[PDB]
Structure 1
């Protein structure tokens, strides 16, 4: 029981060409300031799958590494169709880190850039985990950048609806099997996803990308922990990947333990990397 978005917000275009679904690049009518709008048709069979998606965005978006919730609206539809719920949040102008690697020579980021982004993801995850919230969808597409290289987490669509989605970033425990019938979920599942995102930043695609999603979903709980293809990477980076990709979630380190990892903790070029990333955004824009 909110208000109509008319004169307050307006849709411009669909952002991720399908990746995020019905997510638009919106505009605050009065100021002209950009915002991202998630549009979801409120049906009788989706009444509480939308109500608590608003409650999660408002409460947990108050953190520098999470895209801030602005407000929720309802655009009333004529008698013969369902109403549209508009979920407004801060817009991230630089795009996703999947798009960043895709628009880089050799489809690979500098090891210190991976260290900066991964730390910011972990910092965002730490805020959610302390608040008893699992993201459940950490992937390069759900990790966004702003015009001044700020890293922000997005999508609470599956956080703790009938489609399974991309499997490549899923942790083994997330995928139900014979010895894991109920797929015992944990906050540490996001850390496996964070490690796959680091391989994604280092190679331009997640492990098993060249496979059918159904075969990848079958192999993730059977295959040994994924490794980086190239030997060029530092011993600190291999240790971080190893740390994130522990097959059994029961002996996988916590977000706090991973924040203390030398690859995340020891960042001497922090300022220089932030400028290097800011330069890369401008160069791609023009």
Structure 2
């Protein structure tokens, strides 16, 4: 259901969102219900095909989990594709910690638990987020955690490796799946936990292609937390097991929900309400 209609017939555009870090996203108010939503608008070339997204848009619609950002329908109108999603008034975690500074272990643990619940739901649906990081974890004014859109922000970028028509089936398959297994979101989550702990992912001051070269070496060591004494053993093990080099030995999302760090009691949105208070005042 991609309503071929001007989205302004249903909603009123209020302001920009994200400051351009996710393209042109808008805070919009529903004329009817009065609710607030988010509208991500993506431009067309127009060499793009609206139907190649159908298999991806059905993915974002059939997601009945509270930790995934809700989807409310799409809109295509004058080479402009508007994705309507649940709004999260606190922005991303990256927006937050760039003001509040580093997060606490308890806050990280709650965010990790909520992200795992969304991942374990996503992987049970045999989907892969592909880009778990601070900027794709949204917070609402209730301090609740929402994974951002996935699979849609990938294809249509819209630029591959080679040239699609001359590619080989092995090259074609890898240009789509990307050598991905669901267990790479677990790695991404471990890097995100380090990101939420140290404001920056490991090797952030290193050129991107360089770090990828480093990760193919047979003696490559997965990253760690810089300050040992600052974090608990549970957090240090959570980083170790999420950052398992071999995907065969890497715990699944559900198995990680059994881990000490995220199954401990006392994890709730209040930890983020503290973080959103440290945002406005302190």
Q: TM-score range by the shorter chain?
A: 0.7 to 0.9
1:53 maps to which residue?
56
Q: TM-score, length-normalised on structure 1?
A: 0.83
2:103 maps to which residue?
109
Structure 1 residues not aligned, in runs of 5+ = 78-82, 166-175, 177-181
Offset, 1:183 = 5.2
1:227 maps to which residue?
224
2:258 maps to which residue?
260
Structure 2 residues not aligned, in runs of 5+ = 161-170, 172-176
1:29 maps to which residue?
31
**Deviations for 1:139-166, whole angstroms, at most 9, x for unmatched residues?**
111111110111011122257944689x
Which stretch of the first structure deviates more once superposed, 227-236 or 30-39? 30-39
- The question of whether the paired residues in 2 share the 8 Å contact of 1:133 and 1:159 is answered with no
Given candidates 183, 187, 203, the residue that maps to 1:188 is 183
**Deviations for 1:153-211, whole angstroms, at most 9, x for unmatched residues?**
1122257944689xxxxxxxxxx9xxxxx952100010000000100111111001111
Given candidates 85, 88, 94, the residue that maps to 2:84 is 88
Note closer, same or farther for the CA distance 1:234–1:11 as it changes in structure 2 (3 Å cut).
Answer: same
Given candidates 18, 21, 29, the residue that maps to 2:20 is 18
Offset, 1:285 = 3.3
Distance 1:45 1:91 in 2: 27
2:68 maps to which residue?
66
Mapped pair 1:242 → 2:276: no
Offset, 1:23 = 2.1
Distance 1:164 1:235 in 2: 42
Distance 1:32 1:216 in 2: 47
Offset, 1:97 = 1.2
1:169 maps to which residue?
none
Given candidates 259, 263, 270, the residue that maps to 2:267 is 270
Offset, 1:212 = 1.7
SS at match of 1:27: strand
Distance 1:7 1:17 in 2: 25
Distance 1:281 1:230 in 2: 25
- The question of whether the paired residues in 2 share the 8 Å contact of 1:9 and 1:27 is answered with yes
Distance 1:143 1:20 in 2: 12
Offset, 1:101 = 1.7
How many residues are paired up?
Answer: 259
Which stretch of the first structure deviates more once superposed, 134-143 or 275-284? 275-284
Mapped pair 1:97 → 2:93: yes
Counterparts of residues 275-286 of structure 1 (less than 5 Å): 275-285=270-280
SS at match of 2:18: coil
- The question of whether the paired residues in 1 share the 8 Å contact of 2:23 and 2:42 is answered with no
Give the RMSD, CA atoms, in angstroms. 2.4
Distance 2:71 2:98 in 1: 28
Offset, 1:33 = 2.2
Given candidates 107, 113, 119, the residue that maps to 1:119 is 113
Mapped pair 1:205 → 2:200: yes
Note closer, same or farther for the CA distance 1:227–1:160 as it changes in structure 2 (3 Å cut).
Answer: farther
Offset, 1:283 = 4.5
- The question of whether the paired residues in 1 share the 8 Å contact of 2:48 and 2:156 is answered with no
